[PDB]
Amino acid sequence: QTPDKAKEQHPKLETYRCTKASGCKKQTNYIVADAGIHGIRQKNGAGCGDWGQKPNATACPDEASCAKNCILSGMDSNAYKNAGITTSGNKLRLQQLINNQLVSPRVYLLEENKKKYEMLHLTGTEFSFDVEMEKLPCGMNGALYLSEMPQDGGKSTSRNSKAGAYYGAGYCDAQCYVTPFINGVGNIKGQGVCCNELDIWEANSRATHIAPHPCSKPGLYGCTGDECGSSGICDKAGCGWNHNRINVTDFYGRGKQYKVDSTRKFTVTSQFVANKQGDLIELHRHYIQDNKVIESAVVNISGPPKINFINDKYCAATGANEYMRLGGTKQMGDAMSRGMVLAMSVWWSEGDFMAWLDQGVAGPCDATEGDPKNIVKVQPNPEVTFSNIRIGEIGSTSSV
Ligand SMILES: *[C@@H]1O[C@H](CO)[C@@H](O)[C@H](O)[C@H]1NC(C)=O
Ligand SMILES: *[C@@H]1O[C@H](CO)[C@@H](O)[C@H](O)[C@H]1NC(C)=O
């Protein structure tokens, strides 16, 4: 679509770049809401397409018509507030509902000029953030992750692509979903929209999950037919790490009986270790709460190697078969070396209630308390605050 003339007022977010030798340096970034959250409408008020579908055929017979008929609305700071997004200093507060309207925001980190996504090169580096998870009950997902979105939102692929990163265009992830727009142009062919994806943090106050999802195609690729499915170009399931799945059920959860208490703030430090040739070989994680380092626990089931980090051997042993077929940890590492976009979001799920994250082997939630209708009876205004985002050398983004 074509942006109107309203003024975009991106919330500011301060973030940090650190090195062992000179500490962490503060800088200015901006947050942009997904293109779809801005509101894409025809002149008469009708929409241009819903998630899961090709864009409205009357409005979008071809790419050029779609660009002219579908209008994206700029978002001023009140529009950002009303979409559940506010910031303050180094803190990003995302709210699931505003005046009982589901806003479920998803946002990306922009460079200081606001014209390009801030491209993070994570292989061989460290990534830390503080988080506040207390208002996320079962069924909620407060996510911090990376996708290999085009840095300019897809503007360079076509003369009809106008939004760019400035208005939040170009989203993709490893599920290869069909969205009405792809790279800022109408998805006339209905391709699924795929790209490598690194889920650093997928969580609620009851359970947390980590999962790299490699794709065999680099950058944003529109799939067709079987390319979009489970035997296609991207690993839908990923190679997961959730302490509850490896039988360490007192590691993370609500209260002082857990190693990491989700009702209070804590720091998440992730280190992407590379070998001598520069390939990614392992993903490590540790936590800081009350000034103590809390190391991840070693696998506590029979089968996988007795370690506390992700590697190819841990993935093969715990059944991540598409991950291994698509290249495993090296493949994810390549995407992460080309550079990826940081995405933050909050959501729930009517279809499965986030079962994979916090039910059965994955956590302590029963089978219905994660239903959107029951979540509000536990927490009327589910939300998450991410803050103090620090990117740098291994050993430099956090400390005790
Ligand atoms: C498709 O666009 C046409 C033209 O504006 C509009 O009349 C119709 O309401 C739209 N259909 C949907 C489902 O939005
Ligand atoms: C889970 O943990 C207990 C020890 O806490 C261990 O004895 C048990 O066998 C483990 N279960 C599996 C299936 O590994």
Q: What is the dihedral of CA 295, 300, 304, 307, to 10 degrees?
A: 20
Q: What is the residue with the minimal CA distance to atom 6 of ligand 1?
A: 46
Copy the structure tokens of residue 136: 């996320």
Residue 45, ligand 1, Cβ within 6 A:
no
CA distances from 84 to 8, 32, 107, 122, 278 (A): 16, 12, 11, 28, 40
Q: List, as own/partner pairs, every contact residues 286-292 make where C-beta atoms lie below 8 angstroms and the sequence separation is at least 24, other chains included.
A: 287/259, 287/260, 288/398, 288/399, 288/400, 289/260, 289/261, 289/264, 289/265, 291/400, 292/400
| Torsion angles phi and psi, residue 37, rounded to 5 | -65, -30
Count CB atoms within 10 A of the CB of residue 353.
Answer: 23
Determine the Cα–Cα distance for residues 206 and 236; give it in Å rounded to an integer.
Answer: 23
- The minimum-distance atom of ligand 2 relative to the CA of 302 is 14
Which of 142, 52, 78 lies closest to 104 in space, CA to CA? 142
CA distances from 254 to 54, 164, 171, 267 (A): 42, 41, 33, 16
Which residue type, as a one-letter code, is found at position 120? L
Determine the Cα–Cα distance for residues 239 and 50; give it in Å rounded to an integer.
Answer: 30
Q: For residue 44, give the ligand nearest its CA.
A: 1
Q: Which residue has the tokens 């709210």?
A: 95
Determine the Cα–Cα distance for residues 105 and 142; give it in Å rounded to an integer.
Answer: 10
Sign of the dihedral through C-alpha 283, 287, 293, 299? negative
Number of H helices, E strands in the chain: 8, 26
| Torsion angles phi and psi, residue 305, rounded to 5 | -60, 150
Determine the Cα–Cα distance for residues 181 and 184; give it in Å rounded to an integer.
Answer: 6
Determine the Cα–Cα distance for residues 253 and 363; give it in Å rounded to an integer.
Answer: 9
Determine the Cα–Cα distance for residues 250 and 255; give it in Å rounded to an integer.
Answer: 10
Count CB atoms within 10 A of the CB of residue 303.
Answer: 10
Determine the Cα–Cα distance for residues 49 and 41; give it in Å rounded to an integer.
Answer: 9
Rounded to the nearest angstrom, the distance between the alpha carbon of 44 and the centre of ligand 1 is 9
Determine the Cα–Cα distance for residues 320 and 306; give it in Å rounded to an integer.
Answer: 17
**How was this model experimentally determined?**
X-ray
Copy the structure tokens of residue 293: 């380092």
Determine the Cα–Cα distance for residues 8 and 167; give it in Å rounded to an integer.
Answer: 8
Q: Which residue has the tokens 């292989």?
A: 123
147 touches 197 (CB < 8 A): yes
Count CB atoms within 10 A of the CB of residue 113.
Answer: 9
Q: Which residue has the tokens 């940090």?
A: 16
Host H or E run for residue 273: strand 266-274
Copy the structure tokens of residue 383: 């939300």
Copy the structure tokens of residue 325: 């077929």
Sign of the dihedral through C-alpha 272, 315, 335, 182? negative
DSSP, res 298: P
Calculate Rg over the CA atoms of the chain. 20
334 touches 274 (CB < 8 A): no
Point out which residues pair with 117 in neighbouring strands: 110
Determine the Cα–Cα distance for residues 208 and 365; give it in Å rounded to an integer.
Answer: 13
Determine the Cα–Cα distance for residues 199 and 202; give it in Å rounded to an integer.
Answer: 7
Determine the Cα–Cα distance for residues 13 and 189; give it in Å rounded to an integer.
Answer: 37
1 touches 47 (CB < 8 A): no
Determine the Cα–Cα distance for residues 159 and 162; give it in Å rounded to an integer.
Answer: 8
Determine the Cα–Cα distance for residues 241 and 162; give it in Å rounded to an integer.
Answer: 39
Host H or E run for residue 376: helix 372-378
Sketch out the chain's domains with CATH numbers. Answer: 2-400 (2.70.100.10)
309 touches 297 (CB < 8 A): no
Q: What is the dihedral of CA 389, 391, 393, 398, to 10 degrees?
A: 0
Indicate the SS3 state at residue 185: strand
Q: Strands 340-348 and 119-120, how do they pair? A: antiparallel
Q: For residue 297, give the ligand nearest its CA.
A: 2
233 touches 162 (CB < 8 A): no
183 touches 157 (CB < 8 A): yes
Determine the Cα–Cα distance for residues 221 and 372; give it in Å rounded to an integer.
Answer: 32
Active-site residue, 202 included: yes
The number of angstroms, rounded, from the C-alpha of 41 to the middle of its chain's C-alpha atoms is: 26
Host H or E run for residue 35: helix 35-38
Active-site residue, 197 included: yes
Q: Which residue has the tokens 């598409």?
A: 322
37 touches 346 (CB < 8 A): no
Rounded to the nearest angstrom, the distance between the alpha carbon of 246 and the centre of ligand 2 is 9
22: exposed, middle or buried (Cβ count in 10 Å: 0-12, 13-18, 19+): exposed
Catalytic hit among 8, 132, 148, 197: 197
